[PDB]
């Protein structure tokens, strides 16, 4: 019944030293039934990354919508959109449906191409921006993720250390959530290289 917990799923993002990381599970379900183990929730528009949890139809719809808008932005501005600007676009777009909202929990992650500054942000389903320094969490295991991130996280981690921290935060949170798991992906992001890693986890 609750749209935000029909399909299930989680997203988490973290800042490091001159880098950011964003990760998600791969599950898509119909309540108790597991339907897909390949439903990736992280998308990218140039160098800006967007993770979306919640109702799967709205996740798909919003990806297609932000692809639409970022492609026009680029044609007119003659440059790729930056994380700070994209974050405002996400907020604007969500609030325009204030009284008929998309049932989602978006998470933005990326590095400003000019300043080199790492950036992450989280939103509620209607556009409120949470611009955190440390980490952002979203999904059906958000309580679990808060507990993991708040204890495991420390600032200024190197890319290969940050990978381990965010991975362990996601994995153990997902293993205490019935509606999350069935695989996981982690993006490690630096100013001009991005690595994507699929994690091995329990498939129940």
């Amino acid at each position: 019944s609750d749209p935000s917990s029909i399909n299930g799923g989680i997203v988490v993002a973290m800042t490091g030293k001159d880098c950011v990381a964003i990760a998600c599970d791969l599950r898509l379900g119909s309540q108790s039934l597991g339907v897909s183990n390949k439903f990736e929730k992280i998308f990218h528009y140039g160098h800006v990354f967007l993770g979306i949890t919640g109702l799967a139809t709205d996740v798909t719809t919003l990806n297609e919508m932000f692809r639409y808008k970022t492609n026009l932005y680029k044609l007119k501005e003659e440059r790729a959109i930056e994380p700070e600007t994209f974050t405002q676009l996400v907020s604007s777009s969500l609030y325009e449906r204030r009284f008929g909202p998309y049932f989602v929990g978006p998470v933005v992650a990326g590095i400003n191409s000019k300043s080199g500054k790492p950036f992450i942000a989280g939103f509620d389903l209607i556009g409120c921006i949470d611009e955190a320094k440390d980490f952002i969490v979203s999904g059906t295991a958000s309580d679990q993720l808060f507990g993991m991130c708040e204890s495991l996280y420390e600032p200024n981690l190197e890319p290969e250390d940050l990978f381990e921290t965010i991975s362990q935060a996601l994995l153990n949170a997902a293993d205490r959530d019935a509606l999350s798991g069935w695989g996981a992906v982690v993006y490690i992001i630096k100013k001009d290289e991005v690595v994507k890693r699929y994690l091995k986890m329990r498939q129940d």
């Binding site: 679990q144 808060f146 507990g147 708040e150 495991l152 994995l171 949170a173 205490r176």
Partner: protein, 222 residues
């Protein structure tokens, strides 16, 4: 309409060592968005080297503990001052809880102590009386925040040995009391940050063959 139940918040944590056990819990008592007390004890020494905490609805928690303490007293009277073992106490508590199957004690309950072989023991209960022995258990408001952390840092879940790449697990080495207390404090400090009902103070009860010892630590008061 009269609602006979309420939520006084709070969070509790039990960890079983090799020859010891700990039962910790925050000292904050609340209703809705108000604080009732910054120091209201929640973990109790019930006698016979057993510690207990009933988290949830305070009135039902105080009543259950009071009854179990009473059950220990009468166990001595009836069976020639025999020591109530932790397994026997656990089974006794199941029957205390199920006596109200149709008007339950609204509490998540944990007891800790030592088994008859001297090893550390933790038992966990649901409000209607289902129980089971465990190595690690967080209960109450911030239970969902803490348990995943304990799966990772106590049972080494999803942790493998470098170089093998997922082929060989991290071996399950035992934890010392000093190591356990670090995990307890970091658990409650993290829970305090993200959960509004957790804070003010942390009281830990440590159980060994020598007896029951207490430790208290301040937490954030916001």
């Amino acid at each position: 309409q009269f609602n006979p139940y309420g939520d006084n918040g709070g969070t509790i944590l039990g960890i079983a060592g090799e020859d010891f056990a700990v039962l910790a819990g925050d000292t904050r008592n609340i209703t809705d968005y108000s604080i009732n007390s910054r120091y209201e004890p929640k973990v109790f020494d019930c006698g016979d080297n057993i510690v207990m905490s009933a988290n949830g609805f305070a009135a039902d928690g105080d009543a259950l503990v009071k009854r179990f303490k009473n059950s220990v007293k009468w166990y001595h009277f009836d069976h020639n001052d025999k020591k109530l073992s932790i397994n026997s106490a656990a089974r006794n508590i199941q029957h205390l809880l199920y006596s109200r199957r149709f008007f339950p004690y609204y509490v998540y309950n944990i007891i800790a102590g030592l088994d008859e072989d001297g090893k550390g023991a933790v038992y966990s209960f649901d409000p209607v009386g289902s129980y089971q022995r465990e190595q690690c258990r967080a209960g109450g408001a911030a239970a969902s925040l803490i348990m995943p952390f304990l799966d990772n840092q106590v049972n080494f879940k999803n942790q493998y040995e470098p170089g093998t790449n997922g082929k060989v697990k991290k071996p399950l080495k035992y934890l010392s009391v000093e190591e356990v207390i670090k995990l307890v404090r970091d658990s409650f400090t993290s829970a305090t940050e993200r959960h509004i009902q957790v804070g003010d103070g942390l009281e830990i009860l440590i159980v060994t063959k020598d007896g029951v010892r207490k430790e208290f630590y301040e937490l954030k008061r916001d």
